[PDB]
Amino acid sequence: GAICHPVFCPRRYKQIGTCGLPGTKCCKKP
């Protein structure tokens, strides 16, 4: 697993447990 609970393409990482929508407009490096 690369993110907590992704639904699109969040740039954030599992190592901090983002568990949300940190930047739907970004989509850069999921």
From Swiss-Prot:
Keywords, ordered alphabetically: Antibiotic, Antimicrobial, Defensin, Disulfide bond, Secreted, Signal
Induction remarks: Up-regulated by TNF, IL1B, Gram-negative and Gram-positive bacteria, C.albicans and bacterial lipopolysaccharides (LPS). Up-regulated by inflammation in skin keratinocytes in epidermal tissue.
An example Gene Ontology biological process: killing of cells of another organism
Cysteines paired by S-S bonds: C4-C19, C9-C27
Top-level taxonomic group: Eukaryota
Region (Phosphatidylinositol 4,5-bisphosphate (PIP2) binding): 1-14
MF terms (GO), sorted A to Z: CCR6 chemokine receptor binding; chemoattractant activity; phosphatidylinositol-4,5-bisphosphate binding
Coarse class of the protein's main subcellular location: secreted
GO cellular component: extracellular region; extracellular space; Golgi lumen
Tissue specificity note: Expressed in lung epithelial cells (at protein level). Expressed in foreskin, lung and trachea. Lower expression in kidney, uterus and salivary gland tissue. Expressed in epithelial cells of the respiratory tract, with higher expression in distal parenchyma of the lung, trachea, and tonsils, and lower expression in pharynx and adenoid, and low expression in tongue and larynx.
Outcome following mutation: Y13A: No impact on fungal cell permeabilization. No impact on antifungal activity
Subcellular location: Secreted
The protein's assembly and partners: Monomer. Homodimer.
Cited function: Exhibits antimicrobial activity against Gram-negative bacteria and Gram-positive bacteria, with highest activity against Gram-negative bacteria. Antimicrobial activity against P.aruginosa seems to be salt-sensitive and is reduced with high salt concentrations greater than 25 mM. Also exhibits antimicrobial activity against the yeast C.albicans. Permeabilizes C.albicans cell membranes via targeting plasma membrane lipid phosphatidylinositol 4,5-bisphosphate (PIP2), thereby leading to cell fragmentation and cell death. Acts as a ligand for C-C chemokine receptor CCR6.
Family classification: Belongs to the beta-defensin family. LAP/TAP subfamily.
Name of the protein in question: Defensin beta 4A
Source species of the chain: Homo sapiens
Lineage: Eukaryota, Metazoa, Chordata, Craniata, Vertebrata
Part of the intact protein present: 35 to 64 of 64
